[PDB]
Ligand binder design. Structure first.
Ligand SMILES: Cc1cc2nc3c(=O)[nH]c(=O)nc-3n(C[C@H](O)[C@H](O)[C@H](O)COP(=O)(O)OP(=O)(O)OC[C@H]3O[C@@H](n4cnc5c(N)ncnc54)[C@H](O)[C@@H]3O)c2cc1C
Ligand SMILES: Cc1cc2nc3c(=O)[nH]c(=O)nc-3n(C[C@H](O)[C@H](O)[C@H](O)COP(=O)(O)OP(=O)(O)OC[C@H]3O[C@@H](n4cnc5c(N)ncnc54)[C@H](O)[C@@H]3O)c2cc1C
Ligand SMILES: Cc1cc2nc3c(=O)[nH]c(=O)nc-3n(C[C@H](O)[C@H](O)[C@H](O)COP(=O)(O)OP(=O)(O)OC[C@H]3O[C@@H](n4cnc5c(N)ncnc54)[C@H](O)[C@@H]3O)c2cc1C
Ligand SMILES: Cc1ncc(C[n+]2csc(CCOP(=O)(O)OP(=O)(O)O)c2C)c(N)n1
Ligand SMILES: Cc1ncc(C[n+]2csc(CCOP(=O)(O)OP(=O)(O)O)c2C)c(N)n1
Ligand SMILES: Cc1ncc(C[n+]2csc(CCOP(=O)(O)OP(=O)(O)O)c2C)c(N)n1
Ligand SMILES: [Mg+2]
Ligand SMILES: [Mg+2]
Ligand SMILES: [Mg+2]
Ligand SMILES: [Mg+2]
Ligand SMILES: [Mg+2]
Lengths: 586, 587, 586
């Protein structure tokens, strides 16, 4: 059949499992938007306020799905706003296909052309960047983008298609590749690696299992619970792993790291051995600025590139996390030293339950205070009173990150969402809409800073029009609080950190969202209830302090050290001059 | 002599004429922000709601100054939001220096590092991209960035500095290059080229002078007025040149192009010869999608890359526009065929005034009607009643761009501001705030679509805190109106074009800005008076049609052609298969 | 200890298993060459005639070793000659670390600087490109280059180091990373993928096993022989797989492809099922220009990126080749339909032995003719008379490639060497020296075209000085014969294909190598014997025809189709003009 390039793009997206499109109109995306109107996928298109906002919605959607189920489709110069959200998708292992419709290929390369987008600007960011030159390559390029996005590591793929190819027509026989099969990711380890891992776990005096986001992608929750109870070993997570182990369990120490739970950081500091499953041991995760001293450890990942890149393990294993844990459970009964004992009766149990008890006690102190300005831990205690096991907690980047991570007690995977890998401010609100779209039976609670919300609150348009009932708490301190605190620490003085807020209640109301301030009442519980009862997206304005959280609270972290001291650098004495220095010698 | 890298960065910026910093705080820009607090630039700091809004402010400030007077200074990952503004700066010839402070150079190249920004993403966009490796190269790199940025052509320069270098200390002797005098840009043309141009101009039956952006940069307004009156030749502009020739003059035909004045397009279609001064003859300018047929022409520019790249001139001249006009003025009296008569007495004068009067009559007609929805041409007629020669008109991108350009009647250079080169949606409000900052005693009027305003109205924080009293009119139609109109024409149906507006008055009021809707009054005149009287940034909501403007109004345009017909493309029958096609051959 | 950057580079190379350095001197490599003189590795440095020649020696060395055992180290502007050999290492999966010493970092970025090498020119080629900014990062960068080079896929890694860092000094504590462990590559498949593969093999009427270079990297020869005899299935290889199965076995069909053995191409055309092990199914390999129609197949690779990229398998499996084959052998006895029968008694045996017999018969016809000009198949028959099982056959790119591939009958892996992935002319001679250096108990026989040998015969310097007794046959036809033939086919006329040769015997003699022409004698057997007896590198000049081989001989290929016909392309009618067209409308 003769079809337009635009029709073929839509066909390819459908064929590879696309569920949601986030799209922006302009002359170069007109044929694509028309094609979409004639197809199933056309019923699910979000038109965002900005392309960057839309790109964050893709990331929030796909983060919780672990596939490229949301796809961006953008008019040429709109693609120029993608890079920040794309960089998060790359280091954060978020599958994300973006299709940019560039201007007419006939005008490419002409110096005075308009809206010829430099697609090569994505080469250092996307896991795959393709410029499509020929109509008969559109299906093949889209196929390749999805293979790349959904591989190990997951990440973003950018496809640049000059829009004249979307208007042109071609016979479609075999053009969109069909019948594609994927290899399983259930990679098994060799018996001897399994036995060695088991023997170390058994011989350790104070082992820990460290479960990262890979355990979530793996589906390894059930095997992890079994394993930990069988060996009687406390479980620490990364922030992307949090919730793969029920955080109300006695062996649950929570997440390690600089914004994590002190019980986890204590347990990591006390451990003599760690079994790491599905973690990349990253800079703002377990590495803490590459300061963390890891105990002897076994490291199991599906991505060989993360194994041994910085931390040298006792043993590295290329295996799926669930599968590895299943292999361990089978081998443990024939492992020298293993005794089947209730985890409560093991000798390491009391130390772990002590660490968790002290952390819980500290959290209870943080959340117990009444009144205004509010504790962000108190705000999270109120959320927990109305929270379901499938609900999603979203945060932005700032002081507020710490109380959000600390007051989230999670029972399922992929329920904690932010710009994890890159810490890009403004991510929260639009990632929350993305997650809501992907998970319509989850209530989505976002705790955002005021500096953060300033970025993409324009997307209340999308929250209102698509009836996405995200409950947003905006923590107001009229400051970039983390920056305030860190400057205060480093210099004893802050600069560029202070600003005015609008009447956020008034902003919400102007969009037709639910709005309420607790500034005078302190009634967070009632504000949450009325917000939930409205059925609308909601904004609850909650004044807090400039310093509570990431930059001040002691949770046992050791880094990252962003507060450098300098070094004195020797001048170059080799005899060569500086530019302009010739005039000094005259 | 002993200084931190952060102090040397500040010292270099001050040395090369920086007047305004637009900066964004974070763990990598902490040192820089501290150093700036020790400088007189410390009081001239704008902290924008987002780095992209800030980068648009940089573009608006520098567009009106023709130098990199405003500089950006950004925490590592905020640099990832710059690309769209930076691309307009590149093709739009706006000088712009951006300093990105990256994360620690010790952590660079680690696969699991956080906030290590891929500075290489700027290589295809900036006219200069540098990654500084060494503390003793920071002054040198910044010097180079200004050299590129304020060259011919002007554009953006990006410098990536790992922030450990900003904390490190070094003896500062000779580190910041100082005391350069740049080359003059008053390039003279050869005598023979000036005399050939004079002879073409005199021999033409119906000549036109086309003045672009380059005439504004050259400071050539006075020379142009003298040349145009002395030969009696009508003047056509590009949108960036508009105002270099007073548009109330009898010889002013306005701007040619698809959102230009019909008088200018009528003139261009009637001319037998064009003298092109400081125009790049661009896709969305004079070329109109490379469909415009140019008459025989002489092309004078300082940038040889634009001369003969697409349209082949009769004669190409590398020279400064002002300087060339001066040279022409001096040779014309000795040029065979020249006659010294008042421009009103030439026979070509009548046709030009007819073209201008028919255009003015059409504009008068678009101004009439009342009440609701209102005409955007009516909105501009009300602005003109309150507008002084030094005041600035800003627009965003969409249907509304055409009445903003058609309703702007300008008497000075650099008074019409937008994302000219790239038509990046959203640009209007923050570029207007940048322009206001550059000219605190000019009034700045913005006409913006509702789609457009949605991008960076968050920068009302900056407008309110810094008391930048931009007068913004937001044209409401609950639509990407251009898309609605054109998609209906292409396909019989619009898609992805419609959206809800907030209560725009309520948004302004929530920021502390002046807000008023004319939905129930039609009282644009009174709204403008009250907005001006408020002394605050102001937002006036004006309901408009989905169709008025760019997608609907005939102004003599021939292009561009974005509403493509397909071609049917032959399949490759050489024997190579598609991916997956192996499955289709299994019997 | 305070050490120079140069000393630290040498330390890192030693620590990561470097055996051979190929190095070129200049002001920027002076400190490195000095450091090398003070260390074990300094005894093994080849100084080549050119950096490109040297880069091919790295590729020949590392091709046969399957690790980055040879390393390039180059003065700044010398690195500009690397790109061709580096591109082969990338698509050809050859591990190769190259260290470029750039000019002084103080002069970087200055427009009028000399010898500031644009290291970004390697970004699109190397699997990893790093520019080192800081002395304390030299060890870490070299560590990362080796992890990358020796991963799956293998490939080149480029490290650019401004030479001032090689002269500078730093305390060395922990600077070079030590104690690095690698994950095994013995990835196991899930039981159900194994059982499904076994069931298909058993149920097939005419199965084939296709073994690629991955079987060589895997060490899978023994398991392959067992498997094939157990199921009674004929074995086809790729050209990089050739020799993983003894090519004198009754089930050995040889290599498929456009320069392969007709028995293999027949068997592929007759097969109803293929089990593909360690092959990427490439353009100039099995795909034959993407024209080859693959039967239903199972595809097993360690690199998920090759699985399903073009050919859609019945099943894709991420597993090590040897391990997979071991798993199959275990599962086969409990697989429905399997009967233990001598492979000679299976029903498919007669068809396979017929295909091989016809091919052998054709080869015997090609090699039997006496006299001059010579058959290149006759030349390969003479090599076979003096050939050991560990000997290496090298070829360059041309008509001569086909007889070289056809007349090589191999019994061990990694014995057939050329620019396999990219077909870059001139590769042969220097790759042969590289292979000789890596394998000093192998005799290395190169059959090269005259157009090919012209590139890097300057490296006879290296062959003579290091006593590398490569036996080179130069096939003279005074032409780029493959080009002659293909132009003749396409146009009926050739252009740019003809040239003069020097007296090649005289060239060899001028270097102190052994030289002999068979132009008058036809005595290839005696020339080989005297060349071998000399103990020197040798050149034997052998006139041949312009057309024998790749471009003419029927071996059952179907592609690639480089002889396109064109299509008529519609003009653009949208109304926009060409540059300069304005003058046509005047
Ligand atoms: C302000 C801020 C504060 C933060 N604080 C913390 C903190 O305190 N603690 C913290 O942990 N993080 C924190 N982060 C997040 C941190 O930056 C990283 O995003 C996070 O630590 C990475 O988690 P991970 O190591 O589990 O790997 P991920 O990024 O989740 O990647 C998944 C890993 O699992 C592997 N994998 C995938 N699938 C499988 C499978 N099937 N089998 C095996 N392996 C698989 C992948 O190859 C990869 O190595 C913070 C972020 C910010 C912005
Ligand atoms: C929606 C939309 C509609 C538009 N419609 C129109 C329209 O109708 N008409 C129109 O013209 N534009 C239009 N534009 C703008 C258009 O895209 C270009 O930005 C504009 O035409 C470029 O102007 P210019 O050719 O004068 O060159 P500029 O971009 O202003 O560049 C300046 C030129 O002069 C040169 N120069 C600089 N200094 C000197 C000197 N001292 N001496 C000599 N030469 C010098 C430079 O090298 C360069 O060639 C539109 C844009 C948008 C987004
Ligand atoms: C003139 C010329 C003619 C040619 N003619 C032919 C021809 O007729 N036939 C032919 O085959 N080639 C031919 N080639 C070579 C061809 O271009 C390719 O280089 C070759 O076919 C690739 O072999 P391969 O598919 O085995 O993969 P390789 O390039 O050898 O790559 C190895 C593959 O095995 C995998 N692998 C690596 N280790 C393991 C492991 N442990 N377990 C599992 N998998 C692993 C890798 O991921 C990869 O997919 C020719 C080249 C030239 C220049
Ligand atoms: C795009 C971007 N710009 C700047 C920063 C630096 N940054 C990190 S946290 C932060 C503070 C955010 O302020 P707010 O959202 O109000 O949260 P608070 O610290 O007050 O809780 C800043 C400015 C960043 N990470 N990303
Ligand atoms: C970043 C970006 N996204 C999309 C476009 C395509 N585009 C061009 S004009 C326009 C319409 C703008 O709508 P509005 O501001 O409401 O103006 P109207 O057309 O209604 O006057 C769009 C979506 C663009 N140029 N830039
Ligand atoms: C670097 C390079 N240049 C050109 C070619 C194109 N090419 C491929 S085979 C060949 C013929 C080589 O001639 P020769 O070595 O004499 O071998 P013959 O075909 O005569 O056997 C040519 C020119 C190539 N592959 N690589
Ligand atoms: Mg479907
Ligand atoms: Mg805040
Ligand atoms: Mg609108
Ligand atoms: Mg050793
Ligand atoms: Mg030849």
């Amino acid at each position: 059949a003769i079809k337009r390039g635009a029709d073929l793009i839509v066909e390819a997206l459908e064929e590879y499992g696309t569920e949601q499109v986030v799209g922006f109109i302009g002359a170069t995306s007109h044929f694509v938007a028309d094609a979409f109107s004639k197809s199933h996928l056309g019923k699910r298109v979000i038109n965002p306020a900005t392309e960057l906002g839309g790109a964050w919605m893709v990331n929030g959607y796909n983060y919780v799905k672990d596939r490229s189920a949301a796809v961006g489709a953008w008019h040429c110069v709109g693609n120029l706003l993608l890079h920040a959200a794309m960089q998060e998708a790359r280091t954060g292992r978020i599958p994300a296909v973006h299709i940019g419709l560039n201007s007419d290929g006939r005008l490419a390369g002409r110096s005075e052309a308009a809206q010829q987008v430099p697609w090569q600007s994505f080469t250092p960011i996307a896991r795959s960047t393709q410029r499509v030159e020929r109509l008969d390559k559109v299906g093949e390029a889209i196929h390749e983008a999805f293979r790349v996005a959904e591989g190990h590591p997951a990440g973003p793929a950018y496809v640049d298609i000059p829009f004249d190819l979307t208007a042109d027509q071609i016979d479609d026989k075999a053009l969109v590749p069909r019948g594609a099969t994927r290899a399983k990711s259930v990679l098994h380890a060799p018996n001897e690696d399994v036995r060695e891992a088991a023997a170390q776990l058994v011989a350790a005096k104070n082992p820990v299992i460290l479960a990262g986001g890979g355990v979530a992608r793996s589906g390894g929750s059930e095997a992890l619970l079994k394993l930990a109870e069988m060996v009687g070993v406390p479980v620490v997570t990364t922030s992307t792993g949090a919730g793969v182990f029920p955080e109300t369990h006695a062996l649950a120490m929570g997440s390690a790291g600089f914004c994590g739970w002190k019980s986890a950081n204590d347990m990591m500091a006390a451990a003599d051995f760690v079994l790491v499953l599905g973690s990349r041991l990253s800079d703002w995760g377990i590495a803490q600025g590459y300061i963390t001293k890891m105990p002897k450890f076994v490291h199991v990942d599906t991505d060989p590139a993360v194994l041994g890149t910085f931390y040298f393990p006792l043993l590295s294993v290329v295996a799926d996390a669930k599968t590895f844990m299943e292999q361990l459970i089978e081998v443990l009964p024939g492992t020298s030293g293993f005794k089947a004992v209730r985890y409560q009766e093991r000798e390491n149990f009391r130390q772990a339950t002590e660490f968790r008890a002290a952390w819980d006690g500290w959290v209870r102190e943080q959340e117990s205070g009444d009144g205004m300005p509010a504790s962000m831990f108190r705000a999270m205690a109120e959320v927990r009173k109305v929270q379901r096991p499938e609900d999603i907690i979203v945060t932005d980047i700032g002081n507020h990150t710490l109380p959000m991570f600390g007051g989230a007690i999670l029972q399922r995977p992929r329920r904690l969402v932010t710009s994890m890998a890159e810490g890009i401010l403004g991510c929260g609100f639009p990632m929350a809409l993305g997650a809501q779209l992907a998970e319509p039976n989850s209530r989505v609670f976002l705790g955002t800073g005021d500096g953060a919300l300033y970025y993409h609150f324009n997307e209340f348009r999308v929250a209102v029009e698509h009836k996405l009932p995200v409950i947003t708490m905006v923590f107001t301190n009229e400051s970039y609080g983390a920056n305030w605190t860190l400057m205060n620490h480093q210099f004893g003085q802050n600069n560029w950190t202070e600003f005015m807020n609008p009447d956020w209640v008034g902003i919400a109301k102007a969009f037709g969202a639910y709005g309420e301030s607790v500034r005078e009442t302190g009634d967070i519980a009632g504000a949450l209830q009325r917000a939930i009862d409205s059925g609308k997206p909601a904004l609850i304005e909650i004044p807090v302090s400039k310093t509570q959280g990431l930059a001040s609270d002691p949770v046992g972290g050791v880094g990252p050290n962003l507060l450098l001291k300098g070094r004195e650098i020797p001048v170059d004495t080799g005899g060569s001059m500086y530019p302009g220095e010739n005039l000094l010698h005259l």
